A = this chain, B = another copy of it.
Amino acid sequence: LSLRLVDGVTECSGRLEVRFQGEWGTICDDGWDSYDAAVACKQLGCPTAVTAIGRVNASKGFGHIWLDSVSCQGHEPAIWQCKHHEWGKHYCNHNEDAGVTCSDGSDLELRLRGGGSRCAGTVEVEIQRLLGKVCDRGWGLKEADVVCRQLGCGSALKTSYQVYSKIQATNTWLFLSSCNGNETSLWDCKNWQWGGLTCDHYEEAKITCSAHREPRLVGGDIPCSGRVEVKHGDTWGSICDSDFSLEAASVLCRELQCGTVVSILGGAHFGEGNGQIWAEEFQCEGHESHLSLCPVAPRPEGTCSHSRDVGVVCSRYTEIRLVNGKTPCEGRVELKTLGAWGSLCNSHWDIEDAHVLCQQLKCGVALSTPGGARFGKGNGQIWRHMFHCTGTEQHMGDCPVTALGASLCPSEQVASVICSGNQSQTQLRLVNGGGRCAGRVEIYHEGSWGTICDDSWDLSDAHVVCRQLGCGEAINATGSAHFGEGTGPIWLDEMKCNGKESRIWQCHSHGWGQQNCRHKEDAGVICSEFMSLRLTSEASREACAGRLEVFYNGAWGTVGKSSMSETTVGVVCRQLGCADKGKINPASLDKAMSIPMWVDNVQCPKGPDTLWQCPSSPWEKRLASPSEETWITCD
């Protein structure tokens, strides 16, 4: 008895044969596992580093079939010392004659071809200088992550490429049984078959790993803004302002974990780069988790100038730390804004915000908020930001934040949080009214948002609604669908609140779902902390020019001109929706209403698009001369 390989590609590849009684026959495919191949290559003079089953390059054999159902365990010195069934005692057709491929691991290569970069394309496997593809047999993302990890390109996203289908065709295929998604190389996947079988009705395997179009923000004053860069494989390049869109920025900031897009800026706003410039039009739908999944139009024949880079500013720009604590997960809150650190007041600081704060720093569910200055009094600037987190947001930048006109507080009233430090630890809104503290009232119950009926809806009910929402007292409890009809269920019909209840559902009502109303009687509230902005002038052709008026506590007022800057007028103009910059103007037209001025000394940081997050002096309702009133004109 003796073994041999025939019509492979080296001395240790191809169809396997055994001589019995003096005649040369083959082994059957059934029962042929990696252990059997290891035993066979141990018997032969071949390396045993990688021992894979399969008939690379081999055609249908010829002769007798002499063995089948080989059940070796890797503890025997020959293929025929195993628990073979019986000599010539079974049937296998000649299309499933056995084969092996054995290597020392020095010439087994994998590469993706036919794509925009090395991490997207059809998978091509080169074994012993023979090049072929991989067939889709359970080829999921779980299988694909092994290949992406082996190549060094992030994690797999989808099984498809885009460009350059001009790939050389071959008739040899690689078959994967099942892999855990846990291995470092596809060669470590259990029982992968090389060649022999052919697969029709089944196409080649496709890959696009995450490192195909990695985005990055390079230079900016605040954490999540700057010039946009994309990595083509191994090389970094900037993006033209022409080939970009709001959806592209949204998916870019979703990939980088920086929240929803708040600003897209043309021109070298953050500085001209030094590198390659791509011309690749992104056509993102907007729901993709990565830029790699974005379909991209092919390159045109034109090229941009380097001074045409595009920049992005996104929501999550809030820098908060804990200081003066025994551990990093306990201490006093300090927030960076406008260029300096400082402590945080606890006028509107509660547990719901501490949860999000300790989820930002990965310290688990918040435990308590010690009062006074238990971890230390303030020794500098005190920021008066009131955070109104619901509690489910993952970062303080997602929460609604108000800093305009905030009221001061003494240094002995600074917030601080102590937290568990264990990572493993883990219901009312206003809509369609504009802003957060005015509009139709909606309540969450039974997994759905519903409305409150108009009947018996008076100002005392809006007191409780806006006390729960943190908007202070109410000014209007409106009905008859003032802000528009809703959609969905109606949860509560009659309100008999005292006006002192802590939350809305402490109120007396007929019971959940006990309603006799329709969607034209939806309830709405307008409250003290409602803010709106406008520009007024007398019968002009343009509306975005004139006197700045802010709405607060139900009354209009003007804004002081002291300490104004270009960025403040810019954010005001953006909020009104007319331009991204503007210029202050003297007291024009020498005529206006004598309404007083509500707030003065407004300072804006980079990143907010709404004036409400610009810190300023506390509210004051005093009369001012037309010299102190602010007039702006936006371009």
Residues of A within 8 A of B (CB): 21, 30, 88-91, 93-94, 96, 201-202, 299-300, 514, 516
Contact = CB atoms under 8 A, between A and B. Distances in A.
A93 B516 contact: no
A201 B91 CA distance: 11
The secondary-structure label for the interface of chain A is loop
A226 B90 CA distance: 60
Enumerate the 9 nearest inter-chain pairs by beta-carbon distance, A residue then B residue, closest first.
A93-B201, A300-B514, A21-B90, A94-B201, A299-B516, A300-B516, A88-B93, A93-B202, A89-B96
A90 B89 CA distance: 13
Interface centre among A91, A94, A514 (most CB of B within 10 A): A91
A583 to B, nearest CB: 39
Nearest to A199: B93
Contacts of A201: 93-94
Nearest to A92: B89
A533 to B, nearest CB: 42
Nearest to A299: B516
Contacts of A30: 89
Nearest to A493: B300
Contacts of A514: 300
Contacts of A94: 201
- How many copies, total? 2
Contacts of A93: 88, 201-202
A30 B96 CA distance: 20
Nearest to A510: B300
11 contacts: A21-B90, A21-B91, A30-B89, A88-B93, A89-B96, A93-B201, A93-B202, A94-B201, A299-B516, A300-B514, A300-B516
A90 B30 CA distance: 13
Contacts of A516: 299-300
Contacts of A299: 516
Contacts of A91: 21
Nearest to A88: B93
Nearest to A94: B201
Nearest to A93: B201
A147 B534 CA distance: 64
Nearest to A201: B93
A615 B332 CA distance: 98
Nearest to A513: B300
Contacts of A90: 21
A94 B21 CA distance: 18
Contacts of A202: 93
A30 B89 CA distance: 10
A489 to B, nearest CB: 11
A96 B91 CA distance: 12
A21 B202 CA distance: 30
A21 B90 CA distance: 8
A158 to B, nearest CB: 18
Nearest to A297: B518
A89 B95 CA distance: 11
Contacts of A89: 30, 96
A90 to B, nearest CB: 7
Contacts of A88: 93
A93 B91 CA distance: 13
Nearest to A200: B93
Contacts of A21: 90-91
A88 to B, nearest CB: 7
A21 B86 CA distance: 13
A378 to B, nearest CB: 53
Given A21-B91, A88-B93, A89-B96, 8 more contacts: A21-B90, A30-B89, A93-B201, A93-B202, A94-B201, A299-B516, A300-B514, A300-B516
A176 to B, nearest CB: 16
A201 B93 CA distance: 9
A259 to B, nearest CB: 32
A1 to B, nearest CB: 15
A215 to B, nearest CB: 25
A299 B94 CA distance: 39
